[PDB]
Design a protein around this nucleic acid. Structure first.
Length: 98
DNA sequence: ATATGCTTACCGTAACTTGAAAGTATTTCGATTTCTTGGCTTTATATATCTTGTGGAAAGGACGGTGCTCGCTTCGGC
């Protein structure tokens, strides 16, 4: 069975109280009868730390270097930017050249 | 001399969009299975008759260390 949007709060609370070291004990103390890998995916999907914030200037240098080094025609491989630049997903990163 | 007036660069998530990797049903090629006939094995006295294959004969060609001292021959003597 899927979640009911009521266990992620206690999950992140226990993860912050323990230090995000061992997710197995966290899942066992949470009492969901599910594997740690099955709940960690939804935890990271509901987490906000995976995203980014207002754009700086020093990262523009790296983006321009990566473009001038591995861009082809009118297509830009933003997946390479996701691989190199941490924090940027594939959805909202394309705006960096839109 | 400055705040709200409207105007627009842009960093908040979202879905219907183009096409390559990955799971799914389907008929076709080929390999497998199952039928068919028919001889294998016993017997029966019959017995035909003509050839086959043999066999003990005839008869052949085929290959089956070192003195040591009698005596044998050949010249060879005067």
């Amino acid at each position: 069975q899927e979640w009911s949007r009521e266990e992620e709060e206690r999950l992140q609370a226990i993860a912050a109280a323990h230090g995000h070291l061992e997710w197995q004990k966290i899942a066992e103390e949470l009492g969901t009868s599910r594997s740690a890998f099955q709940c960690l995916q939804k935890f990271q999907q509901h987490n906000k730390a995976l995203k980014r914030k207002e754009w700086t200037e020093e990262e523009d240098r790296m983006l321009t270097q990566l473009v001038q080094e591995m861009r082809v025609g009118s297509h830009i491989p933003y997946r390479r930017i996701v691989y190199y630049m941490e924090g940027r997903d594939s959805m909202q990163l394309i705006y960096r050249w839109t």
